[PDB]
């Protein structure tokens, strides 16, 4: 119900209402920023590697 699931987040069958986000690195379905397209985990793990454009840990 994981792989066979992301394999439907890709398509847009009947109605648009069933159109829902989904992380890209993994199949994360919750907490996914339409912007980056990554979950909150992947997002953090990457920003650490530096593989995230213009992104950097804030501080104020």
């Amino acid at each position: 119900a994981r792989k066979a699931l992301i394999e439907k987040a890709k398509r847009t069958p009947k109605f648009k209402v069933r159109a829902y986000t989904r992380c890209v690195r993994c199949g994360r379905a919750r907490s996914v920023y339409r912007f980056f397209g990554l979950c909150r985990i992947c997002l953090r793990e990457l920003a650490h590697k530096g593989q995230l454009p213009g992104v950097r840990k804030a501080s104020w």
Binding site: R25, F35, F36, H48, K49, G50, Q51, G54, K57
Partner: protein, 206 residues
């Protein structure tokens, strides 16, 4: 479970990004995804070179793919047959012009991602981990450096009692920003658990 990445912590200053290219909130997503799909294919067929980094620049509708390595060879072949079929495979799934490149690393022992895969491999090849660590560090500090540090997660030697063998030499202030410390991390994959290794190489400063 503390300590945070020493890279995303230096991003601001010390360390540069690893994929710099301004972008609009309408593109950033698809493009950022591109860099990954690229770092992904270059991950496999290139592992024999030691892809110790992959900086990717882009002005627009182009790509500055640069595979820095301490040992090119297999990257090119002996003229331009290999390194050519890779520029081939790249844009062979990227609607843009994959401008490929290949740099060199003088001292591979002073490269984290490398020393990482190093020990990470002596592991899958059943080696005295207590040694591989004290030896790999005995490679850096010796081959010119100021600090060294290796770490291996649980399942060492195969013992069901998942340990975590330390071992470091020199200096490694992950708290000090003005220092620049190279970090690496590879994953040995054995019959039992799935060990993990961390590399810490201290270099310059100010």
């Amino acid at each position: 479970g503390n300590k945070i990445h020493p890279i995303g912590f230096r991003l601001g200053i010390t360390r540069d990004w690893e994929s710099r290219w301004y972008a609009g909130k309408k593109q950033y997503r698809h493009l950022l995804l591109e860099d990954q799909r690229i770092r992904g294919l270059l991950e496999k067929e290139l592992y024999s070179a030691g892809l110790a980094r992959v900086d990717i620049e882009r002005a627009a509708d182009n790509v500055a793919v640069t595979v820095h390595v301490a040992k090119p060879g297999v990257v090119i072949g002996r003229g331009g047959e290999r390194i050519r079929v890779l520029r081939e495979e790249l844009a062979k799934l990227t609607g843009k012009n994959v401008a490929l490149n290949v740099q060199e690393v003088q001292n591979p022992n002073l490269s984290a991602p490398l020393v990482a895969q190093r020990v990470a491999e002596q592991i899958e090849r059943r080696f005295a981990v207590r040694r591989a660590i004290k030896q790999a560090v005995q490679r850096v500090m010796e081959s010119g450096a100021k600090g060294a540090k290796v770490i291996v997660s649980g399942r060492i030697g195969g013992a069901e009692q998942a340990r975590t063998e330390w071992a470091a030499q020199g200096r490694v202030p992950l708290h000090t920003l003005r220092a620049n410390i190279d970090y690496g991390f590879a994953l040995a994959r054995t019959t039992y658990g799935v060990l993990g290794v961390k590399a810490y190489i201290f270099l310059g400063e100010v």
